[PDB]
Write a protein that binds this ligand. Structure first.
Ligand code: W0A
Length: 165
């Protein structure tokens, strides 16, 4: 199962890890992607997860959007986890860099409650522009299921742990 995680709360765990490397090692039931509404996995966590699937995630995602249209900001969809996980839960956190409502971050984290255990990044962090300290706070105050957070950046991981209330 998951190893080397620091326990933050009853159900939230954290580790300084590359989520792609973590997914390839654990092969969890669910890996969360930091998706956008179009499921265009160009960069950040999404670009990295998609590249690890040899673009199979993007081919599947394009078929999903052709059938269903875009997701909502704060919404999600369950697709294949390919070589990374049984499933990928594509969750759209608000992109502050595109002027989206930060208040939608709680709605985005609520999607995690439909899964007993997840490997996930901090939603709306990184290239999505939100404060990762705030994202972690919303995560611990919203997610009730078991969430294993992978934080790519060591310096950010240390800041998140050392500032955790
Ligand atoms: C082959 C190793 C995996 C890989 O593609 N690393 C690049 C990378 N990992 C990230 C994690 C979070 C956000 C952006 C990331 N970019």
């Amino acid at each position: 199962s998951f190893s080397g995680y620091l326990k933050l709360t009853d159900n939230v765990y954290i580790k300084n890890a590359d989520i792609v490397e973590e997914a390839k090692k654990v092969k969890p039931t669910v890996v969360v992607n930091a998706a956008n509404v179009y499921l265009k996995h160009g960069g950040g966590v999404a670009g990295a997860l998609n590249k690890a699937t040899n673009n199979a995630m993007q081919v599947e995602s394009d078929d999903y959007i052709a059938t269903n249209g875009p997701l909502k900001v704060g919404g999600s969809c369950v697709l294949s986890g390919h070589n990374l996980a049984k499933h990928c839960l594509h969750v759209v956190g608000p992109n502050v860099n595109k002027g989206e409502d930060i208040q939608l971050l709680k709605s985005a984290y609520e999607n995690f409650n439909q899964h007993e255990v997840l490997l996930a990044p901090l939603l709306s962090a990184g290239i999505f522009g939100a404060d990762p300290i705030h994202s972690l706070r919303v995560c611990v105050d919203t997610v009730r299921t078991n969430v294993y957070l992978a934080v790519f950046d060591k310096n950010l991981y240390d800041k998140l742990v050392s500032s955790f209330l």
